[PDB]
Amino acid sequence: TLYDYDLLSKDEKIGETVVDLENRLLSKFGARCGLPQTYCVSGPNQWRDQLRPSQLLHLFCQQHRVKAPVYRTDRVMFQDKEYSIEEIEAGRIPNPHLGPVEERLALHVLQQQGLVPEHVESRPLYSPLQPDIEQGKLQMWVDLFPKALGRPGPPFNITPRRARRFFLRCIIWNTRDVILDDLSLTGEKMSDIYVKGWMIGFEEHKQKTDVHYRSLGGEGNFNWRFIFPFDYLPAEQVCTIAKKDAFWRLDKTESKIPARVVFQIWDNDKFSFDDFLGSLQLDLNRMPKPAKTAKKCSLDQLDDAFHPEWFVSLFEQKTVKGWWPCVAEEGEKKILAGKLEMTLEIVAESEHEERPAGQG
């Protein structure tokens, strides 16, 4: 039974259901448990066997009056038909998780039976006051692990995917080769040049580097790091927002946005007027790999529309660092408007606190 456990209300029952376990205890089919096509020893494709596979196949096949693939010879017979691993791998995506010969064949031959594959049921939630009326649905499934023989392998790993706070490290390594539109009339180059930026949803956390003084080449290095704990889910690869106004959920933020990212950033020269020389506007959630050379500083690389290619994980990298272009603050124009060298990475998928320790 499901109940509504609020702090500001009574926990009235949301749903009711009754399950008869007998049908699962003595079922020969084995369809009662999730049965994935892929073989592994851990995860969604993990192997489940109380006994060595040659014994389970023997006992299972006796129940269904079929012949187990007990042979491991050049021509293994299953139900009087040719059986092999090559005929199993064929027609399938290559399996990085393929394990021991006896166990992998046992899973794959079991897949030749008319059994229910790995599944998630969505069950009706019936109220005690309205037993035939659903007040919602719940996604789940049930696996049985009989102790009658041996000890069946482990339950599938369903470690939840909820709200995350990715440790984005906006590290500014330098200011160099500064492009100015506000020029002096003396021929001497000078401006109040500093770097500013932030991640979407963190406008109140906007941060900037300090001002360089008595420096014409932009000499100096702050090495400042700005943290913007944005939400995201690698399982979905969807752009989401942390510090959500959706108070109703502590779960992962989800919303629909246009396929672009826009920031509200302006130059503010303390000794002049706002110079619209450029601003930093990057999409972290669908970010392309960083440039490692200044040779990428050209017109062909300014197109965000032409680089959706990296719908990939950058979370396997110990760092995601390199060059990115600035854009004139008149919208996401395909123009080079200043250059910045910085670190911008999504790493909390596997290393949230440990990876950042290498720098600070």
Partner 1 sequence: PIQEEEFIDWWSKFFASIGEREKCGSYLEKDFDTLKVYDTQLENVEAFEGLSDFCNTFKLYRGKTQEETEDPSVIGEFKGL
Please report whether residue 315 would count as binding partner 1 according to CB under 8 A.
yes
Shortest CA distance to 281 belongs to which of 167, 188, 197?
A: 197
Q: Which two tokens stand for residue 146?
A: 């009989």
Query: How many CB atoms within 10 Å of residue 290?
Result: 19
Kindly state whether residue 89 participates in binding partner 1, applying the rule CB under 8 A. Answer: no
Neighbours of 183 (CB within 10 A): 12
125 close to 134: Cβ distance less than 8 angstroms: yes
Contact 242, 346 (CB under 8 A): no
> Total residues contacting partner 1 (rule CB under 8 A)?
55
| Residue partners of 24: CB distance under 8 A and separation at least 6 | 32, 142, 144
**338-357: which residues touch partner 1 (CB under 8 A)?**
349-350
Segment holding 3, helix H or strand E: strand 2-3
* Stretch binding partner 1 (CB under 8 A), from 146-154, 233-241, 292-300, 319-327: 233-241
CB atoms within 10 A of CB 333: 13
Nearest Cα to 339, choosing from 168, 169, 172?
172
Candidates 77-85, 114-122, 264-272, 289-297 — which segment interacts with partner 1 by CB under 8 A?
114-122
CA torsion 60-66-68-71 (nearest 10°) is: 170
Q: Closer to partner 1 at the Cβ: 36 or 197?
A: 36
Does 303 belong to an annotated binding site? no
Q: Could you say which residues in the range 138-157 bind partner 1, by CB under 8 A?
A: 141-142, 156-157
42 or 130, CB closer to partner 1?
A: 42
Strand partners, 60: none
- Letters for 151-190 (x = contact with partner 1 by CB under 8 A, - = none) are -----xxxxxx-----------------------------
Q: Which position among 221, 312, 318, 359 is part of the footprint of partner 1 (CB under 8 A)?
A: 312
Q: Which stretch binds partner 1 (CB under 8 A): 39-47, 64-72, 197-205, 322-330?
A: 39-47
Beta-carbon contacts of residue 96 (< 8 Å; ≥ 6 apart): none
Among 45, 209, 279, 301, binds partner 1 (CB under 8 A): 45
- 9 versus 159: smaller Cβ distance to partner 1: 159
Binding site for partner 1 (CB under 8 A): 19-20, 22-24, 26-29, 31-32, 36-38, 42-45, 92-93, 96-97, 114, 116-124, 137, 141-142, 156-161, 233-238, 254, 311-313, 315-316, 349-350
